[PDB]
Specification:
The complex is a heterodimer of chains A (29) and B (252).
Chain A lengths: L19 H7 L3
Chain B lengths: L4 E2 L8 E6 L4 E8 L4 E4 L5 E2 L4 E2 L5 E5 L13 E10 L14 E5 L17 H7 L5 E6 L15 E6 L3 H6 L9 E4 L19 E5 L6 E9 L10 E5 L4 H10 L1
Antiparallel strand pairs in B: 1-11, 2-3, 2-7, 3-4, 4-9, 5-6, 7-8, 8-9, 10-11, 10-13, 12-15, 13-14, 14-15
The chains are: A mainly alpha (29), B mainly beta (252).
The structure holds ligand 0G6.
The site of ligand 0G6 has 21 residues of chain B, from strand 14.
PDB class: hydrolase/hydrolase inhibitor
Keywords: serine protease, HYDROLASE-hydrolase inhibitor complex
Assembly: dimeric
């Protein structure tokens, strides 16, 4: 998978974007 | 994108804009899957009912863009197309089944903080993430409301839940297939949002809870109106068409 899907300004910097937690929480709800 | 919000800069580095050269016309969205390949919806290139049938020389793509009201010098990149490949069984006559196309760039694009490829799903990813109730994210420069400004300057983003197939099927008289899935909130769920005309070809992405990577599970394909209660947007099921994608790239 090389570096696919890891954003330079987010994942690569251990920074979360403003709404991605809504996606992670949807795996429960 | 209806009822979405402005994207943060660099939030969707695989976002691609597909343009008609002349006259200048933003046609659709697309996504970057490697430094030379871009994924999009077939109907953005071929749709005989609307007298649409573009060749490589009629188009161009812009990569790494955030705002349309600013020329992002040396960040955004324009690329010419070497070849277009439309799925051979793309059903433009009826229901847009297999609404997918690949475009090879004449020259590779350089990755940067603003240009980076999205992952394509494999069997394990499709089985674990493509489930009703789970939310994915759709992005685009398409219409802000069901119509015809009304088009955004900044890339729009909206998170939407995948909908159970029987609900998708009963929501429309158009025949749905296993090569599609639908998403959107149900009536009175407390939230709204949808892709819309102009958003086609854009990615429906999901973040893996296991490796932190973004996977493109769908391609904005069709709908009836935008954001209407009881209707849902439909997306090309990318994993279902993965074998075809691999075949095209392996052979080019
Ligand atoms: C090409 C895209 O920009 C656009 C996306 C619309 C997404 N809408 C919602 N609510 N999520 N697709 C289209 O406009 C496609 C192309 C062919 C016509 N079309 C439609 O969505 C029609 N509204 C419905 C339809 C007609 C014929 C075959 C399939 C669907």
């Amino acid at each position: 998978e090389a570096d696919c899907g890891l954003r330079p300004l987010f994942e690569k910097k251990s920074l979360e974007d403003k709404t991605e937690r809504e996606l992670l929480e949807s795996y429960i709800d | 994108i209806v009822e979405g919000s402005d994207a943060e800069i660099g939030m969707s580095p695989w976002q691609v804009m597909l343009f008609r050269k002349s006259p200048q016309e933003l046609l659709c969205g697309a996504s970057l899957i490697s430094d030379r390949w871009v994924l999009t919806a077939a109907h953005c290139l071929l749709y005989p009912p609307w007298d649409k049938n573009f060749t490589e020389n009629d188009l161009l793509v812009r990569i790494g863009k955030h705002s349309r009201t600013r020329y992002e010098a040396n960040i955004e990149k324009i690329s010419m197309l070497e070849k277009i490949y439309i799925h051979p069984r793309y059903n433009w006559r009826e229901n847009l089944d297999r609404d997918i196309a690949l475009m090879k760039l004449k020259k590779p694009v350089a990755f940067s903080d603003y240009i980076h490829p999205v992952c394509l799903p494999d069997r394990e990813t499709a089985a674990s993430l493509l489930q009703a109730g789970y939310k994915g994210r759709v992005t685009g420069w398409g219409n802000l409301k069901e119509t015809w400004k009304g088009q955004p300057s900044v890339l729009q983003v909206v998170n939407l839940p995948i909908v159970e197939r029987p609900v998708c099927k009963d929501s429309t008289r158009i025949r749905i297939t296993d090569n599609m899935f639908c998403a959107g909130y149900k009536p009175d769920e407390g939230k709204r949002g949808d892709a819309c005309e102009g958003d086609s070809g854009g990615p429906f992405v999901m973040k893996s809870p296991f490796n932190n990577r973004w996977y493109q599970m769908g391609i904005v394909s069709w709908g009836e109106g935008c954001d209407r209660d009881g209707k849902y947007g439909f997306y090309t099921h990318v994993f279902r068409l993965k074998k075809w994608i691999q075949k095209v790239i392996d052979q080019f």
